[PDB]
Amino acid sequence: PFEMSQMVLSDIARLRNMPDLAKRIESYQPQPDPLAQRKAELEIALLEAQIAETQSKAIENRASAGYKATQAQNVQSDTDLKNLDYVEQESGVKQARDVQK
Amino acid sequence: AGYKATQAQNVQSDTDLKNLDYVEQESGVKQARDVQK
């Protein structure tokens, strides 16, 4: 850490008959930039947001697969109805039913 | 995802109705009901 570098630099300055420069190098306390810490916190928050968004996307994909299976079942039922109607038309059952009424 | 599950449930209900209509048509229940009126 730079704190011990401060001690070494202050000792060098004090030994070379420059005491004022040493008292500065000693009195200097470095402070972190609040903007950088804010940026790091926002980056962490954004990363968790992307994780949540990906989880929600996977859930939506599963739901879409289920609805796309239900649609296939409904299509199969519609196909069965179409086959029944075709059989009735070919065999003349519809004509007989219409004649009856 | 929730709305896409609700849609699946509605599709299942529609399929049940289609099966009921197919059974009624095959068994002639619809013809009897029409004859009654």
Side-chain angles (χ1 to χ4, degrees), chain A residues 1-40 42-87 91-93 95-96 99, chain B residues 1-23 27-29 31-32 35:
Chain A
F2 148 79
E3 280 62 41
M4 281 95 78
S5 298
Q6 277 194 330
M7 209 167 46
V8 170
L9 268 172
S10 163
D11 278 352
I12 290 176
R14 217 210 313 288
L15 160 73
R16 286 311 208 228
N17 288 343
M18 323 149 93
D20 40 31
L21 180 61
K23 182 54 161 47
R24 311 176 73 74
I25 310 182
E26 282 192 37
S27 73
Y28 170 58
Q29 164 153 50
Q31 296 305 26
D33 177 354
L35 271 63
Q37 178 65 239
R38 202 51 202 151
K39 286 332 118 172
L42 301 181
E43 268 146 20
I44 297 313
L46 182 163
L47 188 87
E48 311 156 290
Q50 320 219 263
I51 300 286
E53 156 193 356
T54 307
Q55 245 177 262
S56 66
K57 197 36 172 73
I59 275 296
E60 188 202 11
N61 261 354
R62 285 199 221 140
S64 100
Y67 170 58
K68 242 179 251 260
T70 324
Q71 166 251 311
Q73 233 184 5
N74 161 295
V75 152
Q76 171 93 320
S77 194
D78 181 339
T79 283
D80 283 338
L81 261 53
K82 287 181 130 82
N83 281 329
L84 182 142
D85 295 18
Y86 179 49
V87 170
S91 304
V93 186
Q95 190 76 77
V99 158
Chain B
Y3 170 58
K4 242 179 251 260
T6 324
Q7 166 251 311
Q9 233 184 5
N10 161 295
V11 152
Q12 171 93 320
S13 194
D14 181 339
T15 283
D16 283 338
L17 261 53
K18 287 181 130 82
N19 281 329
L20 182 142
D21 295 18
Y22 179 49
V23 170
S27 304
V29 186
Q31 190 76 77
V35 158

Short mmCIF file of all heavy atoms in Angstrom, two decimals, chain A residues 45-62, chain B residues 1:
data_model
loop_
_atom_site.label_atom_id
_atom_site.label_comp_id
_atom_site.label_asym_id
_atom_site.label_seq_id
_atom_site.Cartn_x
_atom_site.Cartn_y
_atom_site.Cartn_z
N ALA A 45 -25.54 -3.37 -9.49
CA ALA A 45 -26.99 -3.38 -9.59
C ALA A 45 -27.44 -3.76 -10.99
O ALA A 45 -28.39 -4.54 -11.15
CB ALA A 45 -27.55 -2.01 -9.20
N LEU A 46 -26.77 -3.24 -12.01
CA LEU A 46 -27.11 -3.58 -13.39
C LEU A 46 -26.85 -5.05 -13.67
O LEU A 46 -27.63 -5.69 -14.38
CB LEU A 46 -26.32 -2.68 -14.35
CG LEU A 46 -26.47 -2.75 -15.87
CD1 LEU A 46 -25.90 -1.48 -16.48
CD2 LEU A 46 -25.76 -3.95 -16.49
N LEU A 47 -25.77 -5.61 -13.12
CA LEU A 47 -25.49 -7.03 -13.32
C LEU A 47 -26.59 -7.89 -12.71
O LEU A 47 -27.07 -8.85 -13.34
CB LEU A 47 -24.13 -7.39 -12.73
CG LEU A 47 -23.61 -8.79 -13.02
CD1 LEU A 47 -22.84 -8.81 -14.33
CD2 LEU A 47 -22.74 -9.29 -11.88
N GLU A 48 -27.02 -7.57 -11.49
CA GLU A 48 -28.14 -8.31 -10.91
C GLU A 48 -29.42 -8.11 -11.72
O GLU A 48 -30.23 -9.04 -11.83
CB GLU A 48 -28.36 -7.91 -9.45
CG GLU A 48 -27.09 -7.92 -8.60
CD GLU A 48 -27.19 -7.01 -7.39
OE1 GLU A 48 -27.19 -5.78 -7.57
OE2 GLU A 48 -27.26 -7.53 -6.26
N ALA A 49 -29.61 -6.92 -12.29
CA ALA A 49 -30.77 -6.68 -13.14
C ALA A 49 -30.74 -7.58 -14.37
O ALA A 49 -31.78 -8.13 -14.77
CB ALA A 49 -30.84 -5.21 -13.55
N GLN A 50 -29.58 -7.73 -15.01
CA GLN A 50 -29.47 -8.62 -16.16
C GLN A 50 -29.72 -10.07 -15.76
O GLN A 50 -30.34 -10.83 -16.51
CB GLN A 50 -28.12 -8.49 -16.85
CG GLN A 50 -27.58 -7.09 -16.97
CD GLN A 50 -26.89 -6.83 -18.29
OE1 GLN A 50 -25.67 -6.93 -18.40
NE2 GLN A 50 -27.68 -6.50 -19.31
N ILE A 51 -29.23 -10.48 -14.59
CA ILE A 51 -29.49 -11.84 -14.13
C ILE A 51 -30.99 -12.07 -13.96
O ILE A 51 -31.54 -13.09 -14.42
CB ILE A 51 -28.73 -12.13 -12.82
CG1 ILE A 51 -27.22 -11.99 -13.03
CG2 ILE A 51 -29.07 -13.52 -12.30
CD1 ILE A 51 -26.60 -13.12 -13.82
N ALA A 52 -31.68 -11.11 -13.33
CA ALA A 52 -33.13 -11.24 -13.15
C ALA A 52 -33.85 -11.25 -14.50
O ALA A 52 -34.81 -12.01 -14.69
CB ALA A 52 -33.65 -10.10 -12.27
N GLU A 53 -33.41 -10.40 -15.43
CA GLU A 53 -34.04 -10.35 -16.75
C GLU A 53 -33.86 -11.67 -17.49
O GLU A 53 -34.80 -12.15 -18.15
CB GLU A 53 -33.46 -9.19 -17.56
CG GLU A 53 -33.57 -9.36 -19.06
CD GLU A 53 -32.71 -8.36 -19.82
OE1 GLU A 53 -32.09 -7.50 -19.17
OE2 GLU A 53 -32.67 -8.44 -21.07
N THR A 54 -32.68 -12.27 -17.41
CA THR A 54 -32.46 -13.57 -18.05
C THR A 54 -33.33 -14.65 -17.42
O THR A 54 -33.88 -15.50 -18.13
CB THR A 54 -30.98 -13.95 -17.97
OG1 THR A 54 -30.18 -12.88 -18.50
CG2 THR A 54 -30.71 -15.21 -18.78
N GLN A 55 -33.46 -14.64 -16.09
CA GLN A 55 -34.33 -15.61 -15.44
C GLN A 55 -35.78 -15.44 -15.90
O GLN A 55 -36.47 -16.43 -16.20
CB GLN A 55 -34.23 -15.47 -13.93
CG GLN A 55 -33.65 -16.69 -13.23
CD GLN A 55 -33.49 -16.48 -11.74
OE1 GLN A 55 -32.40 -16.16 -11.26
NE2 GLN A 55 -34.57 -16.68 -10.99
N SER A 56 -36.25 -14.20 -15.98
CA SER A 56 -37.60 -13.94 -16.46
C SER A 56 -37.77 -14.37 -17.91
O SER A 56 -38.83 -14.88 -18.29
CB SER A 56 -37.94 -12.46 -16.29
OG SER A 56 -37.14 -11.66 -17.15
N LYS A 57 -36.74 -14.17 -18.73
CA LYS A 57 -36.81 -14.60 -20.12
C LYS A 57 -36.93 -16.11 -20.22
O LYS A 57 -37.69 -16.63 -21.05
CB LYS A 57 -35.58 -14.11 -20.88
CG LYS A 57 -35.72 -14.14 -22.40
CD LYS A 57 -37.14 -13.80 -22.83
CE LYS A 57 -37.23 -13.64 -24.34
NZ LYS A 57 -37.14 -14.95 -25.04
N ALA A 58 -36.18 -16.84 -19.39
CA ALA A 58 -36.30 -18.30 -19.38
C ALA A 58 -37.69 -18.74 -18.95
O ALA A 58 -38.27 -19.67 -19.53
CB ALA A 58 -35.24 -18.91 -18.46
N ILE A 59 -38.25 -18.07 -17.94
CA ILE A 59 -39.61 -18.41 -17.49
C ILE A 59 -40.61 -18.16 -18.62
O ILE A 59 -41.51 -18.98 -18.87
CB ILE A 59 -39.96 -17.60 -16.23
CG1 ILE A 59 -39.44 -18.32 -14.98
CG2 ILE A 59 -41.47 -17.39 -16.13
CD1 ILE A 59 -40.08 -19.67 -14.75
N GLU A 60 -40.47 -17.03 -19.32
CA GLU A 60 -41.36 -16.73 -20.43
C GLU A 60 -41.21 -17.75 -21.56
O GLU A 60 -42.19 -18.10 -22.21
CB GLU A 60 -41.10 -15.32 -20.95
CG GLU A 60 -42.10 -14.84 -21.98
CD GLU A 60 -41.57 -13.73 -22.86
OE1 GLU A 60 -40.35 -13.46 -22.80
OE2 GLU A 60 -42.36 -13.12 -23.61
N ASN A 61 -39.98 -18.21 -21.80
CA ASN A 61 -39.77 -19.24 -22.82
C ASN A 61 -40.48 -20.53 -22.45
O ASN A 61 -41.10 -21.18 -23.30
CB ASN A 61 -38.28 -19.48 -23.01
CG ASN A 61 -37.72 -18.75 -24.21
OD1 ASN A 61 -38.46 -18.14 -24.98
ND2 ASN A 61 -36.41 -18.81 -24.39
N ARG A 62 -40.41 -20.93 -21.17
CA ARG A 62 -41.13 -22.12 -20.74
C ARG A 62 -42.64 -21.96 -20.91
O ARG A 62 -43.33 -22.87 -21.38
CB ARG A 62 -40.79 -22.44 -19.28
CG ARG A 62 -39.41 -23.03 -19.08
CD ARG A 62 -39.30 -23.74 -17.73
NE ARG A 62 -38.02 -23.48 -17.08
CZ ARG A 62 -37.87 -23.26 -15.79
NH1 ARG A 62 -38.90 -23.27 -14.96
NH2 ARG A 62 -36.65 -23.03 -15.30
N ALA B 1 -45.10 -14.59 -19.31
CA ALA B 1 -45.19 -16.01 -18.98
C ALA B 1 -46.54 -16.35 -18.36
O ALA B 1 -47.16 -17.37 -18.71
CB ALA B 1 -44.05 -16.41 -18.05
#
